[PDB]
Amino acid sequence: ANRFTSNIKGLTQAARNANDGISVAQTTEGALSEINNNLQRIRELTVQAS
Amino acid sequence: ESTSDPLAALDDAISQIDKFRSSLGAVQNRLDSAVTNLNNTTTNL
């Protein structure tokens, strides 16, 4: 029973960590998209200046 | 004695003015980007 409950608690904590990693990935994706917008604007401005 | 090259000075003033306006617009764009970034990361937090 002790082995069982240790494994169960570990699995719960691991699921929590996975959710946290998902949140980190979402934040990084938001930042990357924010940079992508400026990159596209620079692309258009360079096309205008060419 | 009148101004030697009046149109040149007027064009220079206009250039300074619209350069400052372009700077203001660019800063506004940057601030909009920053605020939407913060708004979307607050929800994740």
d(CA B41, CA A31): 9
Q: Closest Cα partner for A34 from B28, B27, B38?
A: B38
The CA-atom distances, in angstroms, between A40 and each of A22, A32, B2 are: 27, 12, 49
Tokens 């800063």 locate to B27
H helix runs in B1-45, sequence order: 6-44
CA distance A20 to B23: 40
Encoded tokens for A39: 């990159």
> Residue-wise over B16-41: b if at least 16 C-beta within 10 A, else e?
eeeeeeeeeeeeeeeeeeeeebeebb
Q: How many CB pairs under 8 A join A and B?
A: 17
A 12-41 residues with CB below 8 A of B?
A: 23, 26-27, 30-31, 34, 37-38
Tell me the technique behind this structure.
cryo-EM
Tell me the C-alpha distance between A32 and B45, whole Å. 17
B41 has a chain A CB within 8 A of its CB: yes
CA distance B42 to chain A (A): 9
**Please, are residues B37 and A27 in contact by the beta-carbon 8 Å criterion?**
no
Give contacts of A38 with chain B, Cβ < 8 Å.
Answer: 33
